[PDB]
Structure 1
Amino acid sequence: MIQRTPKIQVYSRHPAENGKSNFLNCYVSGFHPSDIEVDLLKNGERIEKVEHSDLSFSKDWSFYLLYYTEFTPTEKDEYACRVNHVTLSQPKIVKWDRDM
């Protein structure tokens, strides 16, 4: 069958302000089939209390999910999204960049 590779965006719910509580988002979209693994990473370590949206899909039938966790950004702490999918030969890791 025709499989589609996930697109990934990593970003915050509100503009990132060091010290203020916020939400870390990882939006995975455009993928098929629906099985997927998404981890949020804090300094390379998996974050434990991560929720996600209900499986939905776009007009082109491709799936999307939002994974999110509360977080309070700092200046040196690093955050990333790591995705596994049948289309990917290795986990795809997208680093959070507060300017994007």
Structure 2
Amino acid sequence: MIQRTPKIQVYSRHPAENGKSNFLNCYVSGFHPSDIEVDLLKNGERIEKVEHSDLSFSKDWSFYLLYYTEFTPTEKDEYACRVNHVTLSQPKIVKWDRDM
């Protein structure tokens, strides 16, 4: 039975500006089957109030989800997305890069 690993992108809803409130997004897509865990991290620690979109899928049947939280970027606060899926040996961490 065929399984598909999630693609992960970490980015902000609006262009990033230090000290301006924004949204940190983690978008997982291309995966199958649909169980997945996604956390947003602030300096390596799990952020508490995170919302996500309702489960849906693309024309290729692969699922996608958007996780998001309000945040205020600074010069030195590190943000990341940690994802586990049955298809990964251990959680994958992708760092938020402003130019990405």
TM range (shorter): over 0.9
Deviation at 1:90, TM superposition (A): 1.0
Q: Deviations over 1:30-65 (max 9, x none)?
A: 000000000000000000000000001000000000
**Distance in 2 (alpha carbons) for counterparts of 1:42 and 1:74:** 11
Match of 1:56 in 2: 56
- Provide the secondary structure at the position in 2 that maps to 1:88: coil
Structure 2: 5+ residue runs without aligned partners? none
Cα displacement (A) at 1:94: 0.2
In the alignment, what sits opposite 1:29?
29
2-structure distance, mates of 1:50, 1:59: 27
C-alpha offsets along residues 61-84 of structure 1, whole Å, 9 cap, x if unaligned? 000000000000000000000000
1: distance between equivalents of 2:71 and 2:40? Answer: 11
Partner of 1:90: 90
SS of equivalent residue, structure 1 residue 93: strand
CA distance in 1, matches of 2:92, 2:63: 17
Supply the RMSD in Å over aligned alpha carbons.
Answer: 0.3
For these two proteins, the number of residue pairs brought into alignment is 100
In the alignment, the residues of structure 1 paired with residue 19 and residue 79 of structure 2 have an alpha-carbon distance, to the nearest angstrom, of 15
Identity %: 100
TM-score normalized with structure 1 length: 0.99
- Structure 1 stretches (4+) deviating beyond 4 angstroms? none
- Identify unmatched segments of 5+ residues in structure 1: none
CA distance in 2 between counterparts of 1:22 and 1:64 reads: 22
TM-score by length of 2: 0.99
For 1:44 and 1:19, the matched residues in 2 are separated by 20
